[PDB]
Design a protein around this nucleic acid. Structure first.
Ligand SMILES: [Mg+2]
Ligand SMILES: [Mg+2]
Ligand SMILES: [Mg+2]
Ligand SMILES: [Mg+2]
Ligand SMILES: [Mg+2]
Ligand SMILES: [Mg+2]
Lengths: 192, 121, 67, 338, 72, 36
RNA sequence: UUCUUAGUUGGUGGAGUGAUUUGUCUGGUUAAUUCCGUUAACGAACGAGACCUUAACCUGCUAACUAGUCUGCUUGUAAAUAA
């Protein structure tokens, strides 16, 4: 039988419509269908292993990233589970089919390469890769959570939850994530 | 950075040089040979020599092997198969001369002897 | 926000550019409504293999160099 | 017309590395097929197979018992009279006695110094012969007591590749002019025939290349020999100033085995297997190289995996061949076609 | 050693044992079924997570980090 | 020094120092089955 | 410390009156004067290697009252048996 996520979230409840992300994500594999986002896997070894990482394992990783406070996946797996419960209680959708969308949206499609010649700082038009795109997307999403999450009674599992939602919506006023997603392209569309 | 020390190469070269006949296309079998065949201090180094020596074996399964000499074994059996003629490609009987050639010959005075000239339109 | 995102995939990974030694130059093939098939030589940044798919937000480009 | 068309029967998948040894059960009852098959791979394990009935799902049989044993390669397997005991030779410098019905080895003969390349089982299952890189043939008690070792005057140059015992005519007649013996073939390309009591009977320089194998006809009349020599030589236990018959099989020879009846010789080469006939004076009665099961790995293609072993079943109908990719193939013979 | 690791071993033992049982106490074929079965889902059940810890170095405060270095 | 029966220095060969003993010479007899 | 970078020499032969050079190179190749190969050079010496320690594999050997498992016993909770 099908191993649901956290015990209650069918993986086959999602599909990657765009071809871009098809190989640069995890929902799709048999091996990916995990109960727990903890694999102590050995990704990050070859030069593209990162791929085969169950999308959420990646989220958890990028999540335990602030110095002193972090470095302990144990907990982070939690902050992500609660956040999924919370995302569900609002749109009652398969929260992976949410987080997933968000991942696809929050990734800038264009960036500018700083190429300076003798003091002058010029830039060019650059198209952002897929692996890079997803990486940026998650990094971004989480990046923001902490932003508000600080001296706030709002919790990461809440901040994050509230983020993954709007990040899927493209709501440019409710996602520190998509703000840059747009600006980076905009500024980049200027330098180009 | 998998390159071979000169020593590693020399060994494989000289091993193949002496035992070609015996050497196989299998590393393991060859490694065993190389060890029974000479003084290889490092067990590891032994392999390197065999692993590479084995490589050369497959490059001789081609023939072009710079640096190696397979005398009796091959090089010589080479001569044994290439010395059977029947009539010197040169006919001392009838020989041919062209314009120029005959021109030089008529000066030399040897213009015409037992060799016939042929004209062409 | 009405953009003309034509999806194109990687035909051949040319070389690396921008002494920032991180940018990659790639030959593309398209698959979208507008045209399709048209081949371009665009400049990427980031992890990219042969055959991926990239959303170009401007088909009128194709800068290039190979020296 | 009436011709030999080699119809395939099935494949046995389960071995990691080369399949260096194969043996099929003996006829526990006059003319009855034996449902027992044993193989030995470089993967270090011995194999007991569960033969299938009329299979063609893709396979011909399935693995029944795998023998965890030797610390290295398995060079050969000798099978006991009754299908229930077997010895294995390894490079690990030892031999093993497997009670074929219990993945256990009740006796390991330790005494060899170098790797072992062959295990010879004596008719009267009490004499165990082992040949290896040492250039020595050792005699073991069904226990493990290394008893005797082929002396210097007798052993030969280079290592030994294979040693066997001439079979045994059952009827207590006055048998052949020859007395049972055991011949050994060494890498020095020399075939030697031994008078039971480890005394030289016949040592003739056979080939120029090393000899990888030899086989004795059930008659105990002739012996087939081949190696890098690329040529198969067959000898008459009588006039031996020359081979009773010689053939040329494409590439190097690894295994040679006559039919338990039929009267043909199956030769294991790097190509595949070429079967000859002593009835005629032809030169290649049959021929199969068909090797490419793992080869279908979308992109990964190991053209022609060389065969490492040959073995017919009791009767002489079925034919097995172990190959590089660690896969045994089954070939049956149908004639009178067309 | 640690909470997480032990779990990984307790895991790896189960997987190895279920397979190990079928080897000597069942058809060697049934073993192959389960082996690939697990292998297909995860290797950490049969394989062994090779890596260990990596020893420090007097070059600095840790295994690969080092005392600051003021240049100017 | 490769002799356990000597007090010269070394005993183990130099790690590179690889010799490759050339094949020796051989002669022998045969046991043909006479033809008379 | 230069630098653990990969360089450094000398015999004979070649070029220069000479300091000096070639040898140790045009091109590839490599972490490397590491190889392929080039070749007025040929042979060689010390360096990187090689080596040595530690780490990762071995249901196979060698053993174990200063390791541990199992087998027959027996004991406590339990109704017993299981646990
Ligand atoms: Mg001089
Ligand atoms: Mg001078
Ligand atoms: Mg030199
Ligand atoms: Mg210089
Ligand atoms: Mg100089
Ligand atoms: Mg150069």
């Amino acid at each position: 039988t099908q191993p649901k996520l956290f015990g209650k979230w069918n993986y086959d409840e999602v599909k990657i419509q765009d071809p871009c992300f098809q190989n640069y994500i995890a929902c799709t594999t048999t091996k990916s269908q995990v109960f727990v986002p903890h694999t102590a896997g050995r990704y990050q070894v070859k030069k593209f292993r990162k791929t085969q990482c169950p999308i959420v394992e990646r989220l958890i990783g990028t999540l335990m990233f602030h110095g002193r406070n972090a470095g302990k996946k144990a907990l982070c797996i939690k902050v992500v589970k609660n956040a999924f419960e919370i995302i569900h209680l609002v749109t009652g959708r398969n929260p992976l089919e949410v987080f997933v969308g968000a991942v696809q949206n929050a990734g800038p499609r264009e960036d500018s390469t700083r190429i300076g010649t003798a003091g002058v700082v010029r830039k060019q038009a650059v198209d952002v890769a897929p692996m890079r795109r997803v990486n940026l997307a998650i990094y971004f999403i989480i990046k923001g959570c902490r932003e508000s999450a600080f001296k706030s009674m709002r919790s990461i599992a809440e901040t994050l939850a509230d983020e993954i939602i709007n990040a899927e919506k493209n709501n440019t006023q409710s996602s520190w994530a998509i703000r840059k997603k747009d600006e980076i392209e905009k500024v980049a569309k200027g330098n180009r | 950075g998998r390159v071979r020390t000169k020593t590693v190469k020399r060994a494989a070269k000289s091993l193949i040089e002496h035992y070609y006949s015996k050497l196989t296309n299998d590393f393991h079998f060859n490694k065993k040979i190389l060890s029974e065949v000479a003084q290889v201090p490092s067990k590891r180094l032994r392999n390197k020599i065999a692993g590479f020596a084995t490589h050369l074996m497959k490059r001789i399964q081609k023939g072009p092997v710079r640096g190696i000499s397979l005398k009796v074994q091959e090089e010589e059996r080479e001569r044994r198969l290439d010395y059977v003629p029947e009539k010197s490609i040169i006919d001392i009987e009838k020989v041919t001369i062209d314009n120029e050639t005959k021109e030089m010959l008529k000066k030399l005075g040897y213009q015409n002897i037992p060799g016939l000239v042929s004209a062409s339109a | 926000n009405t953009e003309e995102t034509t999806k194109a995939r990687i035909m051949d990974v040319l070389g690396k550019t921008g002494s920032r030694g991180g940018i990659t130059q790639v030959r593309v093939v398209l698959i979208s409504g507008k045209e399709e098939g048209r081949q371009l030589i665009r400049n990427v940044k980031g992890a990219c293999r042969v055959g991926d798919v990239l959303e170009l937000m401007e088909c009128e480009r194709e800068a290039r160099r190979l020296r | 017309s009436l011709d030999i068309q080699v119809v395939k029967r099935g494949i046995l998948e389960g071995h990691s590395d080369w399949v260096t040894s194969i043996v099929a059960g003996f006829s526990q009852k006059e003319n009855e097929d034996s449902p027992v098959l044993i193989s030995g791979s470089r993967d270090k394990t011995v194999m007991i197979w569960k033969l299938y009935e009329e299979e063609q799902n893709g396979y011909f049989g399935i693995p029944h018992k795998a023998l965890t044993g030797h610390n290295h390669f398995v060079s050969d397997l000798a099978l006991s009279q009754e299908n229930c005991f077997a010895i294995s030779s390894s490079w690990d410098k030892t031999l093993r006695l497997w009670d074929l019905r219990t993945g256990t080895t009740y006796k390991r003969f330790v005494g060899h110094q170098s790797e072992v390349y062959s295990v010879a089982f004596s008719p009267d299952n009490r004499q165990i012969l082992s040949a290896g890189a040492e250039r020595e043939i050792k005699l073991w008690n069904i226990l493990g007591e290394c008893k005797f070792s082929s002396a210097e005057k007798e052993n030969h140059s280079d290592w030994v590749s294979c040693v066997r015992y001439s079979p045994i005519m059952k009827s207590a007649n006055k048998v052949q002019p020859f007395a049972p013996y055991f011949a050994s073939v060494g890498w020095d390309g020399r075939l030697k025939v031994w008078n039971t009591n480890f005394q030289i009977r016949y040592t003739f320089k056979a080939h120029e290349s090393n000899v990888n194998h030899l086989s004795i006809s059930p008659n105990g009349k002739y012996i087939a020999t081949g190696g890098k020599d690329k040529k198969l030589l067959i000898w008459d236990i009588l006039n031996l100033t020359y081979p009773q018959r010689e053939f040329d099989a494409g590439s190097t020879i690894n295994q040679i085995a006559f039919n338990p009846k039929l009267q043909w010789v199956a030769v294991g080469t790097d190509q595949g297997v070429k079967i000859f006939n002593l009835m005629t004076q032809s030169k290649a009665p049959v021929c199969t190289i068909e090797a490419e099961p793992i080869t279908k790995a979308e992109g990964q293609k190991g053209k022609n995996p060389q065969c490492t072993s040959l073995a017919w079943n009791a009767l002489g109908k079925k034919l097995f061949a172990g190959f590089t990719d660690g896969v045994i193939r089954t070939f049956s013979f149908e004639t009178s076609a067309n | 050693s640690g909470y997480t690791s032990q779990v990984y071993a307790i895991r790896q033992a189960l997987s190895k044992g279920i397979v190990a049982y079928h080897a000597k106490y069942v058809d060697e074929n049934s073993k192959r079924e389960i082996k690939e079965q697990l292998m297909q889902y995860d290797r950490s059940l049969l394989v062994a997570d090779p890596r260990r810890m990596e020893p420090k170095k007097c070059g600095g405060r840790g295994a690969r980090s080092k005392m600051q270095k003021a240049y100017r | 020094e490769p002799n356990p029966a000597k007090k010269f220095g070394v005993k183990t060969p130099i790690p590179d120092n690889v010799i490759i003993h050339p094949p020796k010479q051989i002669t022998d007899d045969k046991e043909i089955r006479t033809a008379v």
